[PDB]
């Protein structure tokens, strides 16, 4: 019934695992010869047959068909077509339950290396641009209200730091994914005394699963991957929100390149930050995959259950999504143009009310009291229709006699950001230190 | 308006952070003296005042009130009540934006140590019981259908292995949580050249945040904790499903102790596995917290936003949930009674059809062909109204002449499980190895 | 910027909306000529080409390519290849923002109609089977422990009742999806005084959208469908759990047919309930889609934002999933075979302990004490090897002097079940009434 | 096993259901006497005590303690302390499985009624304000880029329209919650021929549950409420996003009142839109609750399972959250002040580029080419320092000979807006019509 089969994994999804499945079968065939189930004469026929399939796949031949239950079944059918009955010995002691997780892990191993590379390039793009644009200052925000002046590079580095934690989380997930489950059989293990150390070595896993029942029932590797990817997308969704708002004509801080923007087929004046919006939307898309698999696993009994097959489509979609989003984000950041003129112009006096308060603190006034006075000063300006940096010393002294002609030094945005030299701050020396820390972090991640 | 204030964090939630907030303020006051904002005379008054509050909290005095915005505000108000205006200097350069994440991290640091301890006791309980009940064999399942015989200890260890990965994930989350954000100010950093190394040391964090904007905008530590906790609960929900099914009169494999079960106020014969059901239900509860915070963070602009305050209730609920569930799970596993008689009795012949097939494989028949023959044998039994272990050699030979009197050795459940000696399998030697690996793993985790 | 396009929807997803897009464009064309933007002659040409594209689509021809942003641009580009510059007039006053919601809504109208047909068929299957096997009695469970005897038919009907509510919810969502958004333009509306009542009538919508900004910025209709589908699958995940457990050899109440079961390429004795498992798993799958659109929508500012383009794939996936799951469930319920023998055998005496306490309540003893007495009767039985069923009158007398020889009448399962005549109970008459109410309820839901 | 009880619901949550539990017990008592389980005299006593417990509850007295499993057991235990063993008769044929769904439903009936009142008040606030400021025009956005001019009132109404659908959905959910489950017993129903029509009538439900197994095993009514609430909060998260951005100094369109704003204890110049942010954040909070119950329900077998007890805290949290969020939003919309000046100033010429292309379409030029011409006009303007608004006729002539001096008429924002008269558009007459439709729609929703 084409219907019930419509509910199982699709053709394109199964095809994506075709090569790793063949790689897994080659390792298994070799261990079977060592275990005495295959003679060297038979092993050779099987390897040659499997290489035959590997060759066809590289030629774009699609092996799996709607007739085949899955790639495992498709490759076994194809082998039998190429070499006859000997192909059936390869099935000895092997379960789809271990092949499915082995193939998925091999695929993830390969996919994460590629994702990792693109993520580091994204981080690097942010870091290198922060180095170059280090002298630029614009408003920093809390509640989307102007808070205090900060360096544009501090802003870029904020996102690089968050992405760097994501890179670290990816690495940790990779270690647990890098554990080989082949040899777990259907749930009880392998009964031929197969050499799992041999399979681990040939398939390049770091170690082998400890318990056969767990190895076949769990999808922790999937959840964990989806979770890390979701938090990564959350970071990108916040950075996209930032750039989309900064791209408004109202803010005017920057403009994306033509490559990462599109116009409107109706409104001739439009230039839209499509790339950013797309990236933001993927957070929901990836989160849905995490929610999906968590629910699929919840309350299922041991050990293997057919429900588990929902992992394949979720993993592949997220891999592809991530791989694309990352390059697009890299493209967006490296090619956007900032307006230093508008960023500078956005720097307004009120943002220095905190500095104005600290000024009084330096002269002995408790911050609580100084906070009040500074607000009173902002109020006084707001009342006479002027900026606080315009109030005369006299208007200031009427708030507090502690104000002196030196107060003028407060109304300077460079002086403002430069007071934040303590590690992590927006001062130039702190931004420089960050750039160095991230370069070393990225070096370590790459190692 | 009591209404808009109803939407902010509650009293009991703010109170849970009262002591770490005081601990954070003490560290800050000291750095402020070093930074020249406080004289030794003032620092002493402030520390004494804060100790005063620490004393009151230990006496069960609730400091925060609906009048107070949050614990930070409540403690600052209380300090002012105890020592006067000098209390206001403590606010110098400090933002609620850094205090909120600092206090939450301190709380999580403390909560994870306690959760970790209980999780290891749960793992240990599973491992120690597996050692003792190592000779017990029962049916292993896939699709909730009898698959192959496995050791009850293999089953217990399956869950211990999964919990052990959770323990490892907890450790990784703990390292990123153990990074101190105090000194990030509102978003630009601290402007007094505060000694962050000094704060890190006194508050016991492993390091300090790299970027002030990120330190105040991110809640990765929260998401990550909620995510790891969710996967942990998923594991427990599957183990609960297992035990609930095994607790049915139909399976009859085991019975929970009176302590972890309840009766019915209407049906006098009932004995319900309440504990298990409760644990299973917490997976949804904890998942909801993860979904909650992910959505709260999605698309928010830099840096701090009031939305972020939803993290506190979610973290606390999950901590408390986890802390309780773990002890209950430990209680359930250590006190339940298995029926070795019913487990043994559940071992039926059909489960050895795979072994029956392998038997033919050993005699030269390809598994594919042997699989068919074994099924034919099961079919032959099913047709004459008997068990395959009852078929006479003659009925067997009619399926395949390769069957010999030695086939009798196939119908033995101990022989069945003992063939799975390859690492990870259900054989006794493999189960023993697992017990040792987990004891070393638990030793490492505890270190 | 190819990869940027890798973030777009797939060619297959857009192809899925090809026919409704042509249909929507055909209506706008006629409304355009009426608005005087198109001569009666320019219309005939445009309309002529649209029918052509339609013929290509029906022949499997795929017009959308990797170069086309979406299906809308594909059709415009294709129509231009067919009639030249004149095809460009179709664009007057039209925006993709209104076309995507128009197209997706048309698609959901056609898909929901098909889903309803199958849903109602599933309910009927449960109802009819319930009528036939109405005499079968088996254990009822709470906490998966034997509670009180119920009729297999009560069981089948509880699921039919839940699914009937799903069907009711599906129709309510149908009404809101059936509002035309065409004419909202990019956000401000249409500046040609286009006749929306005409568009509505031709595209067969029940009414038109009240506000243009809302119409192209909202995806409530998507969220609702996904919510209703999710809850529907939750019901199915529960029914699947039930049948999967009842399918175990341990329970032995029923066995699925070979058509909805599958074997194991390793273990020759296996006969697995794949159909049920696949159904249960789609609950997570559909929930995942609901979760993504909710997140996509959250915190987005007005009006249209590119983020919204994620609705299509989620809606299509859930449509095909639900359509297939419903038919599979129908086949499962229809062809499964129950074991009246095992179901009857499962009826154990302790399940009548409540009735036993009630027996004492009728004799005057307070429920609390009666409950306690029944409790002791079952404990006295077990510790004695036998079941409360075989306990001698003396043994019962030992627990309470109220126990007379007429207590024997409590140990009858039909009687137990026949005790529940109050509406909704498991007594035969009540089950029969349910069957009639659901027959009527399905009748009422079809007539709309 | 204390900690086991730490997994139970909280004392506060159970206390929240105290009054409805007493109310439900009062109905069952009368139905019991009628069923002959209680003498007319035993009833008067039982009923007498129940009213007493009710008086304690109204005096803030907390009856549920840490020792009590839930509120139901608390009330029974309390009633027993008041009248002795006789209170035990109330238990006949009753199960906690039916009491929890009965109690929670009663609670939701009372809570939903209050939520509706506030929701409709929020919509009216948006509607009335829309009527008053109907002449205000400002930028309309897509991708957060200036699109086409719209009326501030069109904007306010788009949100009112979305919220009106939420209100419609809330009432549909109300109907399904309004079905009485009392009388389903533990799962099999009631064995005393209890009068359900009597219970229904007294507890004020619209009808009774059709199947006892379904009634105590389902939580659809919970899932629905949470779904509707979630979508409702999504609308609010979007409106909040809008107003938060419009509140920036960069946009300067409006400013919230001091009552819905808050300062910074560090930065003395801050004035933050806390109310809006708090509202946006509750979208995640409520969604989280929907997600948990869906997961709680998923794959659970029939009928009752202890897992279901998680519904209470989720339902209560969402009720209080929604009730407060709605009033806060009403105050926000009501007291915010807009800057007609800044909104008018924001109107920039390029936003009329569509109208400019349309101007050429009226003169015969094909939309595609007209679009291109308009595009060049705006690029020609920018690269020239001025806006398409100031371009000389010659400059326009340079782009297309079709540009005459009457093109000047395109550069008027009222005209731009007044172009959208087709239903749902931003023209004044259309906005006025919307105001009337919503007034009627709110009227129709109250009358039920």
From Swiss-Prot, chains A, B:
The keyword Iron does not apply. GO terms for molecular function: catalytic activity; structural constituent of eye lens. It holds the Pfam family Lyase_1. CDD domains: Argininosuccinate_lyase. GO terms for biological process: arginine biosynthetic process via ornithine. Gene3D superfamilies: Fumarase/aspartase (C-terminal domain) (1.10.40.30), Fumarase/aspartase (Central domain) (1.20.200.10), Fumarase/aspartase (N-terminal domain) (1.10.275.10). GO terms for cellular component: cytosol. Keywords: Eye lens protein. InterPro entries: Arg_succ_lyase_C, Argininosuccinate_lyase, Fumarase/histidase_N, Fumarate_lyase_CS, Fumarate_lyase_fam, Fumarate_lyase_N, L-Aspartase-like. Eye lens. Disulfide bonds: none annotated. The keyword Phosphoprotein does not apply. Homotetramer. Belongs to the lyase 1 family. Argininosuccinate lyase subfamily. Delta crystallin, the principal crystallin in embryonic lens, is found only in birds and reptiles. Despite possessing the necessary catalytic residues, this protein does not function as an enzymatically active argininosuccinate lyase. PANTHER family: ARGININOSUCCINATE LYASE. This is Delta-1 crystallin. The gene is ASL1.
